[PDB]
Every structure is written in C-alpha cells, then in structure tokens.
C-alpha cells in the first residue's frame, strides 16, 4: 500500500555558461574594408571605409 512519487526535469548545466552554441539567422548585411592610400609625397594613410 506504499507509494513512491518520482519527479525529474531538465535544466541548463553549469557548463552552459561557457560551453554553448549560438544559433544565428543570417541576412545580407554590409561590407567594410580598411584601405591604405598614399599619393604624391603624402605618406601612407588609412581609415575604415
């Protein structure tokens, strides 16, 4: 006449803070580059474009 009620559930492990995978949806974005330019007697200059 005795009864044992068993319970169990899933939760994130401790490693999940450091060892996890990020699922991203990717859409067409932007394109950037760093260009190095020199002309005449002007020394090399660069900037993000």
């Amino acid at each position: 006449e005795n009864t044992q009620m068993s319970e169990a559930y899933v939760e994130r492990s401790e490693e999940c803070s450091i060892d996890h995978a990020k699922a991203y949806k990717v859409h067409t974005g932007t394109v950037q580059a760093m260009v190095n330019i020199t002309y005449g007697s002007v020394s090399w200059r660069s900037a993000d474009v």
Binding site: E14, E15, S17, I18, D19
Partner: protein, 52 residues
Amino acid sequence: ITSSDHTTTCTDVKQCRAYLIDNKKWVYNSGRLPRGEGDTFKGKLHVPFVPV
C-alpha cells in the same frame, strides 16, 4: 509524534516503525532521500568548483 520516551501498546518491535525527526541540519535534496512534508526548501548551497 513523541518528544519523550513513550511506551506503546504493541509488544513486538516489528509491529512499529520509528522515524527520527531532527531538523537542526539540512540536507541536499538528493534523489536518494525521501522528501519531507510541506515546503522543505530551506536554503541555497553554492557550487564550489564551477566550470571556467
């Protein structure tokens, strides 16, 4: 629930079950221990060796 020595009617130990209630210290809610009655949650214990 008796707080002092009690003499029961029964004559044979096998006829009775005695459960010790001593809550001075708490225990981890291990899946290998029978749960107590009511809100048995008493506190939190930090995990010492966390992943880093």
